Amino acid sequence: SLMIKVEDMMTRHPHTLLRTHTLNDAKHLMEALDIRHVPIVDANKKLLGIVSQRDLLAAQESSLQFETPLFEVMHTDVTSVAPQAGLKESAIYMQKHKIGCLPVVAKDVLVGIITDSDFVTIAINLLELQEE
DSSP, X not given: OOOOBGGGTSEESOXXXXXXXBHHXXXXXXXXXXXXXXXXXXXXXXXEXXXXXXXXXHHHHHHOXXXXXXXXXXXXXXXXXXXXXXXXXXXXHHHHTTOSOEEEEETTEEEEEEOHHHHHHHHHHHHHHHHO
């Protein structure tokens, strides 16, 4: 039994946006950092939702028929986890429920995110261990 917790492998201090910032802002932020998930938070860093590249692409495609506020784009259903959660359990949850990115929250405050990028890092460290 490995005791790895979500907080041990999550991306800490993720870049976030206010709900009144726009699709265009989230697009730009995603391009600048080459990321695909931007949590939406209030002034006290409390998680309100999250937008993915897929969300932005679907809104843009659905418009061909940039200024939309993020609160209109983000899904009203929000999945999150606590930082003390076990890593294997949380990954299995993400797998089973087809969740690509899982925000990590403590007392409503966003403390981190789990993304595919975090699993790459952890796969590398495990393979390195297996080699050693």
